[PDB]
Design a protein around this ligand. Structure first.
Ligand SMILES: COc1ccc2c(n1)CCN(C(C)=O)[C@H]2C(=O)Nc1ccc(OCc2ccccc2OC)cc1
Lengths: 8, 245
């Protein structure tokens, strides 16, 4: 969820 | 692979820069706030707060700290070149470990206090959490690191290695992470040699020590979540749950 979004 | 000294030193300055840019708390600020200590009245206030309110507050502040560690990784040479699976694996295993190391900056060994919500307090501040073992372990760990007088640059290089660990289960490009780790190892050890600080090598925490601390964190959360499942569901940060269950 969030880690995915934070990385891009 | 980094061949020349100039290359290795470029890595050193790059890592230190990425670190300075992604600290949420300036060392200067933490040091000059050391006299600002919770009173007995405030300590009592903290001890009187419910277990669930204290966990929520702690999970929140740690989550913010983790966000800065994610920025640190995003700024690290090599990290963004790894595949997304591996990026996630490294942050999942390593983000909390980096926080634990960074925490020694906010720790005053002279009086055994940690910076928390604007002032310094001893470990008795955290009694409502019902995890004294975890808390005293974190405090002992910070104490041990404080005894080394870790420089900002050493913290930068050491936390980059904490994160870039090729032994993490689930890595798809193991050999690539290995090459990055080795280059960072040469950077860290070169800097220590240059600064006559290689005597810290034997004094650094055994690898599984950080893992033990993160395991204890997860174990305590599990127990808390069993006692307050709605609180975790409704009032814990999404990122914190994603990382720690
Ligand atoms: C990484 O470097 C630092 C150092 C200090 C702080 C920060 N960043 C962010 C800003 N900050 C604020 C705003 O208070 C400080 C902080 O969060 N202090 C703090 C939080 C929790 C503590 O122990 C509880 C605990 C620890 C680990 C796991 C579970 C836990 O209980 C659920 C002890 C101290």
């Amino acid at each position: 969820k969030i880690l995915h979004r934070l990385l891009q | 692979p980094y061949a020349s000294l100039t290359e290795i030193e470029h890595l050193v300055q790059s890592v230190c820069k990425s670190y300075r840019e992604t600290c949420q708390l300036r060392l200067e600020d933490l040091l000059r706030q050391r006299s600002n200590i919770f009173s007995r009245e405030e300590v009592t206030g903290y001890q009187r707060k419910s277990m669930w309110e204290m966990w929520e507050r702690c999970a929140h502040h740690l989550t913010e700290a983790i966000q800065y560690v994610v920025e640190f990784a995003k700024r690290l040479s090599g990290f963004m070149e790894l595949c997304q699976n591996d990026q996630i694996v490294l942050l999942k295993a390593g983000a909390m470990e980096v926080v634990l190391v960074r925490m020694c900056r906010a720790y005053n060994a002279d009086n055994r206090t940690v910076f928390f919500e604007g002032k310094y307090g001893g470990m008795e501040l955290f009694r409502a959490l019902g995890c004294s073992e975890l808390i005293s372990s974190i405090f002992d760990f910070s104490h041990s690191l404080s005894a080394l007088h870790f420089s900002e640059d050493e913290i930068a290089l050491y936390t980059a290695l904490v994160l870039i660990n090729a032994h993490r289960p689930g890595l798809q490009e193991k050999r690539k992470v290995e090459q990055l780790q080795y280059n960072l190892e040469l950077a860290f050890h070169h800097h220590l040699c240059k600064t006559h600080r290689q005597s810290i090598l034997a004094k650094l925490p055994p690898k599984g020590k950080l893992r033990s601390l993160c395991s204890q964190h997860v174990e305590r959360l599990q127990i808390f979540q069993h006692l307050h499942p709605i609180v975790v569901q409704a009032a814990f940060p999404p990122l914190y749950k994603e990382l720690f269950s």
